[PDB]
Paper text:
KAT1 is a voltage-dependent potassium channel from Arabidopsis thaliana that is mainly expressed in guard cells. KAT1 allows the influx of K+, leading to the swelling and opening of the stoma, and therefore plays a key role in regulating the aperture of stomatal pores on the surface of plant leaves. Comparing with conventional depolarized K+ channels, KAT1 has a uniquely reversed voltage dependence: depolarization causes closing, and hyperpolarization causes opening. KAT1 thus falls into a rare class of hyperpolarization-activated channels, which include hyperpolarization-activated, cyclic nucleotide-gated (HCN) channels in animals, and KAT and AKT channels in plants.
Author numbering:
A (entry chain D), B (entry chain A), C (entry chain B), D (entry chain C): 49 to 492
The structure:
C-alpha cells in the first residue's frame, strides 16, 4: 500500500538516530533531577527538541509493516497495524512524550516540586528502544556475540552507577538538618562550591558499594540513607550475581572448542595406557585427533547433517567434483553417474606415517588421493607408490573382492575421499556397468 | 470414604491461607525475641489465634488422601493415612504448636527468660509449609520457572538479613557492661530512645556484612560479637556462593537458545571459509540456519520424537491433512491411504532463492507446496512454475525414476512437506495402486 | 600369604582412627607454633603418643595388598609391595615421623627456635590421609555426593582460617618494636593478658579478609604485615573463586532434573503455539510429559541401554512376566516363547483421556493392559471396553492386518506394555505358530 | 630455500629467550615510569641491550615459513613471507623497538617528561609474544591444561596488581599540593625516605581494592584519585567476573568424570526403587556400573568410534589377537579369517556373581574368556565349569540354535570378548565353513 516496510534506508537510519536520543535522555533524566535543579531556560530547548522527535515517532509507527509472527511475512494493512500498536506500546509510549515539566509550567508552578519532577522520570520509559536493539543485534549474524553481550553488561552497570549516584545526592542535598549526611561528614559545605560540574564524589560512593569494596569514609549517617543503602545493597547482590553468571556463560562459550578437544585427547591417552599399547600405535591415534581438530573443526559432521538435501549436494559438487571426474575408473562415463558424489567422506586429512588400508581387510571402501603422497608395501618390506591424483583401493570389486593386495600408509600429509561400498556395490542399479570394464583394462 | 482429597476448593485455599500465617509467624518470631521483649498483652492475642489455626491443621491432616508414591493414585484409607502422618511430621509439628510462652506463663514465670523464649523459636519449624510450596510450584507447568526460582532466592536472603539483624541486637541489648558494643560505640544510649520501631540500624549492619561490603563504622567490639561475626561470616560464604551458583544456573537456562544458535552459525562459517566456498552457496547455507531458528525453534525433532505413537499421529492430522488431501496425485483414493501422512517432514520453511531439488539427483522424495511459490528451470535458463498448492517432485516413480526433469528453487518464502520414498515406494503393500494411474492422466 | 588385605575389620577401622590423629595433628600444628610457645611438658606426651602411632603405620604398610591398577586384583607379593611403598610415600612419610622438637631437645637447645620449630610444620604433611579419604568416599556409592563435596569445601576453609589466623599472630607477637602491629593498634598490651585461650581476635581478623568484608579496624601497620597481607589476599582470590566454582558445579548437579523437565515442557508449548493447535490436542501432549517425568524419571531409556544383555533380560523377567503369561493370546504355549519378553516397552503410564490407538493406523503394535482401564469407541460414538488385564490390539495379524477396528483411549490411569511387531511378525521363526490359532478361537 | 622453518633447535630456543625479555620488559616498563624517575645511566644499558634484541627479531622474521592456514603446509617463498609480516605485525612491532627515551635524549630534553615517557609505554606492546604462547601451549598435547589455564589466570592478575600499583603512585608523587593524597594522609612525607626499594605500600593498596576487601586506611582524597579509583574499580568488576567464570569452567573440567558417574548410579537406584526390585538383581546392576567406571573409563565407545578404519583395526590386533587365535573353534583356519576380530566388544570386565548368559535366551552371541573363571549351572542346581581361556557360548550355530544349554555366571573377576552373530552367522560368505566342522568334533 502506502506503508513503509521496517527496512533500509529511510527507517533503519531513523531508528538508529532515536537510539542516540535515548542514551542522552537517560543520562540527563536523573542528572537534572538532582544536580541541576534550576532548569530555567538553558537546557530547556534540548529537552523539548528531543521530546518533539519522540512525538513524531508516535505518528510514524502507525505506518510500519511489523513482520507477523505466525506467518513470517510482512503485514500491509493499516487497521491491523493500528490495533497492534494501540495494544502494546501506545499507553506506555504516550506517557513518556507529553511534557509535564515544560508544558505544565504555565499553570501555577515554578518548574520544580517533589511529586512533579518525579513525573519527569517517565522519560526513562523510552529505554525500551535500546533494550529491544540488543535483542535484535544478538540474532543478527553479521554482528559478534561476545562483543554485544558485554556491551549489554557494561551499559547496565554504567546506568546503575549513574542512577544511584544521583539518587544518593538528592538524599544529602534535601536534608533539612545540617551536614550530618554521607558527604557532609567529610566535606562539610559541599553546596554552592566544590565545582558542581565535578560530581565525581557521588560516583565514587556508588562504585565503592556496587563493587562491594567499601572503605567507610562515605557511609550512611541519618536514617534516610540507611533505608537507601539497604535498598541499594540488595540490588547489588542481584547485580553482581547477574554479571558473574553471565560472564561464566561467556567463558564457557569462549573456551568450549579447546576444552572438548583436550577431553578427547585425555580420553584416548587413558585408553592407550590401561591396555599397555605400544608407542608405535599410540602415536597414530594421537596424531589423528590433533589433525582432525586443526582441519575438520570440532563438529563438522553435525554441521552438514542439518542441511536438507540440496545445500549439501551442492557443497559436494563445488568441492572435489573435478577430483572424481578425471580418474581412470570413471572415464567416458556419463555426467549423471558422477553426479552421485554425495556420500564422499572427504574429510580425511591423514597425518604422515598413518596406515589407511591394512594388509588384509574386509574391503569396504576405495580411496581417491586429493593431495599428498602414499606408498604401498607388501607383508614384510615391498614397494609400490601412488601419485598425487590416483585411486588406491579399487580392488574391492574384482579378483580380490575378499582381500587387499597392498598396505598403504601416508608419507607427506594427505587428503583422501573414501567412497565406501554404497556407490560401487549398492549402486549397481542406476547406471555404469562400464566401471567394472575400465578396471580390467588397467590390469591389461 | 469420608476423606477429602488434597485438591480444590476447600483445601487448596485453606493451604494458601496457612502460608500467610507462616510468613507472619517467621517475621515476629525473631522480632519479638529481641526488640519487643515485653509481650505483655498487646500482640498476645494474634500469636494465640495463629497458634490455634495450626492446632486445627494437626487434626485436619488425618483426613487427606496424599497420592501414593509407587502407585501414583490417591490412598483413601484412614489407617495408612494415620501411620504416614505419625511417622513423618507429627513429632515435628506438635512441637511447634503447644504454647510455651503463653500457656506456661501461669506456673511461676513472667513470660521472659533466656532458656524459655528460645523454646519459642520452634515456631520457625513451621517454615516447611513454605519450603514444600516452592518445590510444588516448580513442577507446576502453569507457573513460571524463572520467577519462582528467584522468589526462592529472594525470600532466603530476606530471612537471613532479618534473622541475623535481630540476633545481633540481642548481643548488644543484653550486655552487662556499658555501651562497648557494635551500636553503642557510635550511638551511646540507643535504649528507651531513638525510635524503637525504626530498627533500620540493625538491618544496615546485617546487609553490610552479608553483601561483604564492610564499612567498619559498625564492627565487633566485645568478644561476644567476635564469636557471632565468625559464625555469621562463615554463613555468608555459603550464602553468596549459593546465590551466584543459582543465578549462573538461571542465566544458562535464560540464554541457551540464542547461544547454541550462534554456535551453529559459527560452525557453518568456519566450514565455508576453510574450503573457500563461493559466496553464492555460502548464502544458501546461512540463510537456512537463520530461518530454521525463527520457525522450527531449536529442538523440534527431539520434541516430537518422544510423543508415543498417537499424540504424534494426531498432530499430523490436524496439520496439513487438507493439504495432502486435495491434490491430483491422490484424488479419488480412500480415506485410509491418506491417513498415513505420519512421516511428512513438513518443517521446511525454505528461504527465497534456495534450491529444493537439483537438476539431476537420486530421486528420493516428492514435495508438496503448502504456501509460497516455486519456479522450475532447465540446465541453462528455462521456465516452468508451480502454483500455491501443487506437487513439484512426482516424477520419481515414472519415466524418470532415475533422474529429475527440473531444478526448482523458491522465490517468495515457502513451506513444503517432503514425502520421501516410504509412502510411495515402501507403501506398495497397503493400498492405492491407483496413484500410479493418476500420474499418467496428467501427462496425457 | 601372611599379608592383610586393605579391607574390614582390623584395617578399615585402624585407618579410620589415624584420620582422627590427623585432624588433631593439623590443629595443634600451627596453634602451638604461635600461641603456646612454651611446650615444656604438658602437651608434650600427646604429641609423642600421636607421633608413635604414625611410626607403627610406617611398618604396617609393608604388609598391605594395594589392588593393582592394570589388573584390578590384589597383589600379595611382599617385594612388589615394598618397591611401591618405597617409591611413593616413604621419603615423604618418614620426614613427618622423626621427632625434631621432642627428640632433638637433648643436644643443645631449649625446644624453641625459628628454624627449628618450622621443621615441626612437616606434621602437616600427614594431611594426605585425609585428602585421599575424600577421594575414596566420592566414588563409594553408599555415601552421598552433595554432602561429601561440601564437607571437603568446609574443611578447606576452616583450615585456611586457622592456619592464617595463627600465622598473623606470629608476626605481631615477634615484632621487636612496640605495639605498632595489627592487634597492638587497638589492644595495646594483648600479651600475658586478655585470656590467651580466647584467640578469637586472631580468627576475627582472618575471617574478615578471607570473606573480603574488610572493616579496617584491624589492618596492616608495619611492612612485615603488608607482605603477609599481599600473600594472603592473593590466596583468597584463588580460594573464593574455587568455592564459587564448586558450588556452581553442585547447584547444576542439584537442579538438573527439574530444569531439563522445564525445558521440554517449554519446547512443547512453543510447538503447539506456532502451529495454532486446538486445546484438545495440546492437553494430550502436555499431560504426557508431566506423567513421564513423575514415573519414568528423566533418562530411563539411557539407563538400561548400558546394561549388557542379561541384567536387562532379568529385569524384564521379574517385572511383568506373570502379566504376559496368563493372557489368552499366549495360553498353552511353551516357557521358552514367553521368555522373549525382552523388547516390551512397558514404560507407558498413560494419563486419563489419552488416545493409545487411533481409528485407522498402520497396525504396528499390540498392547497389554497392566493396571487401569480402557474404553473402545467407533468412528462417531460407540462403546466396547477392555478389563484390567486384557489385550487391546491383537488384530494386527489377522483379518484387519492393514487396519484397526476400535480407537481406545484411557479413563483412569493406565500402564501398558506395547509389544511392537518384533515378537509376533519378526518372531515367526523361533516357536509358536499356535498363537495365530488362539486368536481365532476368541472370535468364534 | 634458504629459509629456516619455525621448529627446533635454533628457533624454538631463540623464541623462548625473547619471552624472558618480555617478562622483564613488562615489569620495569611501569616501574621506572613511576618510582625510578631518574633513569640516568645505571639501568640504561639493560633497556638498550634488550631493545637491541628486539631489533634483530624484526629482521629475522622475514625468513620464517609460517605454516599456511588453508593448506596446513609450510610456505617457503620470501615474497609471501614478506607481505604477511608487513600486514600483520610490522607497523605494530616497529613502534615498540625504536628508542624514544634513550635515542631522543640527544635533541633537547633531559630524558623525562609527561608526554615523552608515556611513549615508552609502547614497550608493553611486545606482550603479544607471551599471549600467543599461552594460545600455543593450550593445544600442545604434551603440556597440561589445568596448569596452563591457571598460569594464564595468575599472570594477568599479577600484572594488574603491578601496573595499577605503579599508576597510583604517580598520582600521589606528582601532586602539586601537599600530602593530601592516599599515602600522604597516613605517611606524611613518604618521599626521599621510607626505603624506596620497598614499594609494598603501593601494592598493598592495589591488592586491597582488586580483591574488593577495602579497609579504608588508604582511600582517595583528591579528585584526581577519585577518577582513577572509578576507572580501576570498574576494571575489577570485569576482572573478578573473569577469574570466577574461568575457574568455574575449570572445576567443571576437573570434576566431570566423577559427577556423571554419580548421575548414572543415581538414575539406576531410582529405577530399582520405583519398580520394587529384589536385592539380588539390584546388586547386579549396581556392581556393573561401578566396575565399568573403574575399567572402561567414562566414554570409551565414543573414543574409538572416531578412529577411521585402520587405527581401530590395529588396536584390536595388538589386543586379544592370540586370544581368539588358539581356541578350538578356530583351529587350523586361515590367517585372513581371524583377521576379522574387528567387532569384538571385549570391554566386558564382569564382576563376580554376575550372570553372563541366562538359561534360555535368543542365542545372540558367543563369549571368549580372556582372564578369570566361569561356572555353568542347570535349571535348579547343576555344575559344569569353563577354564581360563575357553569358549562359553558356542552352541548358537548347532543343535540348540534356538536355545542355550547352561546359565553361566562369573566367580572371580572376568574379562570376556562377546562376538555377536556378525562373524559367525553374518560371516558365512568370506571363508571358514570349517568352523562348523570343528564344533562337532568336540561333541564327539
Ligand atoms: C560514568 C557514567 C557514564 C554513563 C552513565 C549512564 C549512561 C546510560 C546509557 C544507557 C544505558 C542503557 C540502559 C539500558 C540497557 C538495556 C538493558 C537491557 O536490555 O537489559 C535487559 C535485561 C534482560 O536480561 P538479558 O540477559 O538481556 O535477557 C536475555 C533473554 N531475555 O535485564 C536487566 O537489565 C537485568 C539487570 C539485572 C538487575 C538485577 C536486579 C536484582 C534485584 C534483586 C532485588 C532483591 C530484593 C530487594 C528487596 C529489599 C526489600 C527489603
Ligand atoms: C574455627 C576453626 C576450627 C577448625 C580449624 C581447622 C581444622 C582442620 C581439620 C583438617 C581439615 C582438612 C584439611 C585438608 C582437607 C583436604 C583438602 C583436599 O583434599 O583438597 C584437595 C583439593 C583438590 O581439588 P578437588 O576439587 O578435591 O579435586 C578433585 C579432582 N582431583 O585441593 C585444594 O584443597 C585446593 C584448595 C584451593 C586453594 C587455591 C589456592 C590459589 C592460589 C592462588 C595463587 C597464590 C600464589 C600466587 C603467587 C604469585 C605472585 C603474584
Ligand atoms: C524488610 C527486610 C526484612 C524482611 C523479612 C521477611 C521475613 C521472611 C519471610 C519468610 C519467607 C522465607 C522462608 C524461608 C525460605 C524457604 C525456602 C527454603 O528454605 O528452601 C529450601 C532450600 C532447598 O534448596 P534448593 O536449592 O531449593 O533445592 C532444590 C533441590 N532440592 O534450601 C535453602 O534455602 C538453603 C539455604 C542456603 C543456605 C546455605 C548457607 C549455609 C552454609 C553454611 C556454611 C558453614 C561453614 C563453616 C565454615 C567456618 C570454618 C571455621
Ligand atoms: C608481586 C607482584 C609482582 C608483579 C609481577 C608482574 C610480572 C608480569 C609479567 C607479564 C605477565 C603476563 C602479562 C600478559 C598476560 C598474557 C595473557 C593475555 O593477555 O591473554 C589474553 C587473554 C585472552 O583471553 P582467554 O580467555 O585466554 O581467551 C581464550 C580464547 N581466545 O585476555 C585477557 O587476559 C583478558 C584480560 C582480563 C579481562 C579484563 C576485563 C576488564 C573489562 C572491564 C572494563 C570496563 C570498562 C568500562 C568502560 C567505561 C566507559 C565510560
Amino acid at each position: 500500500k502506502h506503508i513503509i516496510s521496517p527496512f533500509n534506508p529511510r527507517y533503519r537510519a531513523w531508528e538508529m538516530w532515536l537510539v542516540l536520543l535515548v542514551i542522552y535522555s537517560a543520562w540527563i533524566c536523573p542528572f537534572q533531577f538532582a544536580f541541576i535543579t534550576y532548569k530555567k531556560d538553558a537546557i530547556f530547548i534540548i529537552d523539548n527538541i528531543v521530546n518533539g522527535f519522540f512525538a513524531i515517532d508516535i505518528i510514524l509507527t502507525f505506518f510500519v509493516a511489523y513482520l507477523d509472527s505466525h506467518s513470517y511475512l510482512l503485514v500491509d494493512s493499516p487497521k491491523k497495524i493500528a490495533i497492534r500498536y494501540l495494544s502494546t506500546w501506545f499507553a506506555f509510549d504516550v506517557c513518556s512524550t507529553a511534557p509535564f515539566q515544560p508544558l505544565s509550567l504555565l499553570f501555577n508552578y515554578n518548574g520544580s516540586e517533589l511529586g512533579f519532577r518525579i513525573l519527569s522520570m517517565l522519560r526513562l520509559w523510552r529505554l525500551r528502544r535500546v533494550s529491544s536493539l540488543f535483542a535484535r543485534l544478538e540474532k543478527d549474524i553479521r554482528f559478534n556475540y561476545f562483543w554485544i553481550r558485554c556491551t549489554k553488561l557494561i551499559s547496565v552497570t554504567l546506568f546503575a552507577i549513574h542512577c544511584a549516584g544521583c539518587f544518593n545526592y538528592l538524599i544529602a542535598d534535601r536534608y533539612p538538618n545540617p551536614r550530618k549526611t554521607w558527604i557532609g561528614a567529610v566535606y562539610p559545605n559541599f553546596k554552592e562550591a566544590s565545582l558542581w560540574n565535578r560530581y565525581v564524589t557521588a560516583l565514587y560512593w556508588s562504585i565503592t558499594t556496587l563493587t562491594t569494596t567499601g572503605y567507610g569514609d562515605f557511609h550512611a549517617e541519618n536514617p534516610r540513607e540507611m533505608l537507601f543503602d539497604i535498598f541499594f545493597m540488595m540490588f547489588n547482590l542481584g547485580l553482581t550475581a547477574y554479571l558473574i553468571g553471565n560472564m561464566t556463560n561467556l567463558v564457557v562459550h569462549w573456551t568450549s572448542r579447546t576444552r572438548t578437544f583436550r577431553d578427547s585427547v585425555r580420553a584416548a591417552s587413558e585408553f592407550a595406557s590401561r591396555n599397555q599399547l605400544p608407542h608405535d600405535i599410540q602415536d597414530q591415534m594421537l596424531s589423528h585427533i590433533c589433525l582432525k581438530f586443526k582441519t575438520e573443526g570440532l563438529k563438522q559432521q553435525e554441521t552438514l547433517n542439518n542441511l536438507p538435501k540440496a545445500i549439501r549436494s551442492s557443497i559436494a559438487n563445488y568441492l572435489f567434483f573435478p577430483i572424481v571426474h578425471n580418474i581412470y575408473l570413471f572415464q567416458g562415463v556419463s555426467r549423471n553417474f558422477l553426479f552421485q558424489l554425495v556420500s564422499d567422506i572427504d574429510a580425511e586429512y591423514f597425518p604422515p606415517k598413518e596406515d589407511i588400508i591394512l594388509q588384509n581387510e574386509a574391503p569396504t571402501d576405495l580411496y581417491i588421493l586429493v593431495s599428498g603422497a602414499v606408498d604401498f608395501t607388501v607383508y614384510v618390506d615391498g614397494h609400490d607408490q601412488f601419485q598425487g591424483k590416483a585411486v588406491i583401493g579399487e580392488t574391492f570389486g574384482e579378483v580380490g573382492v575378499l582381500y587387499y593386495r597392498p598396505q598403504p600408509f601416508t608419507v607427506r600429509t594427505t587428503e583422501l575421499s573414501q567412497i565406501l561400498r554404497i556407490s560401487r556395490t549398492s549402486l549397481m542399479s542406476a547406471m555404469h556397468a562400464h566401471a567394472d570394464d575400465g578396471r580390467v583394462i588397467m590390469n591389461n
